[PDB]
Amino acid sequence: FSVKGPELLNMYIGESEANVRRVFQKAREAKPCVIFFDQIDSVAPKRGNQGDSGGVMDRIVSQLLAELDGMSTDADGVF
Amino acid sequence: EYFFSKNQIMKLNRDLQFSDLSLETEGFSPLDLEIFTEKIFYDLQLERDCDNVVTRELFSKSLSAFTPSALRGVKLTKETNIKWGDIGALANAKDVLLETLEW
Amino acid sequence: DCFSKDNSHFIIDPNRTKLITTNITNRRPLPLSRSNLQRYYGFAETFYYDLHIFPYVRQLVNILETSFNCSQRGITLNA
C-alpha cells in the first residue's frame, strides 16, 4: 500500500480521520500487507508546537498514534 | 422461576436454587431472559443428547457465550486477555485503578 | 373395474389414462444421508460438508434437527 505523502489530509474537518481509518481497515482486510508512509514529515509533525496553526496536523498524528498501535491489536502481519 | 415453568415442563435440578441463578444474571432484561431460557433449553435438548430436563453446568458453559439482547454496540475489548500479573510494576497506579474502577 | 379382486399393482395406458389431479398434498423429502438425488440426476451438487471437521455447520444442522425432532414433543420452541 502506498501512502502518497500528504494523501490523507483532506478538505473537511473529519474526512482525514475517516481516510486514515479506511486505509488501515482495508489493509487489515488482507493480513500480509505493507504500509509505506513516504515522507512521514508531511503527515506526522511534532505535536503541539507554537509555530503552527489550525491544529489538524495534531489531530491526524494523534489518530495515527491511536490506530497504528492502540490496544486490542492482533494479527500483527501488518508491517 | 416463571419462565422455566411456562415455556416447557422442565425444572432446575435439586443441586441449585433459583436465588443463585438470579445472582448469576446481573443486568439481564426480561426479553433477554426470554431469549436466554430458550437458549438454555436448546443447549440441553440436543447439544447434549441426554434424556433429561435438568441442568447445573450448562449455564456456566453457555452464559458467557451469550450476548445480552440490549448489550451490543462498540464491541468490548475482552479479547486482549491481559492479566494484571502481566503488568507487574506500577503499584502506585495499579491500586488506584483497582479501587476506583474494579472495586 | 371388474378386476377389483386385486389392486396392488397396475399399468397406466395412454389409450385409457387421462390426466386428473387433486389439491396439493404434503410429504417429507428424502434425507441426503440415504439417497443423493443430485448425484443420480447429475445436478449441480451441493457441497457435501463433513460435520466432523467444519465447526459452524454442526450448530445449524443441530438447531434444525432439534426443531424437526420436537414435532412429536409438540411445542412452539422453533427459533
PDB file of C-alpha atoms in Angstrom, chain C residues 30-41:
ATOM      1  CA  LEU C  30     -35.551 -37.655   1.171  1.00  0.00           C
ATOM      2  CA  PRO C  31     -32.653 -37.098   3.607  1.00  0.00           C
ATOM      3  CA  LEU C  32     -29.282 -36.695   1.903  1.00  0.00           C
ATOM      4  CA  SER C  33     -27.806 -39.426   4.121  1.00  0.00           C
ATOM      5  CA  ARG C  34     -29.964 -42.054   2.388  1.00  0.00           C
ATOM      6  CA  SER C  35     -30.024 -41.030  -1.295  1.00  0.00           C
ATOM      7  CA  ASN C  36     -28.066 -38.403  -3.264  1.00  0.00           C
ATOM      8  CA  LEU C  37     -30.677 -37.324  -5.810  1.00  0.00           C
ATOM      9  CA  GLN C  38     -28.399 -34.681  -7.354  1.00  0.00           C
ATOM     10  CA  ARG C  39     -25.688 -37.296  -7.954  1.00  0.00           C
ATOM     11  CA  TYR C  40     -28.207 -39.545  -9.708  1.00  0.00           C
ATOM     12  CA  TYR C  41     -29.560 -36.747 -11.920  1.00  0.00           C
TER      13      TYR C  41
END
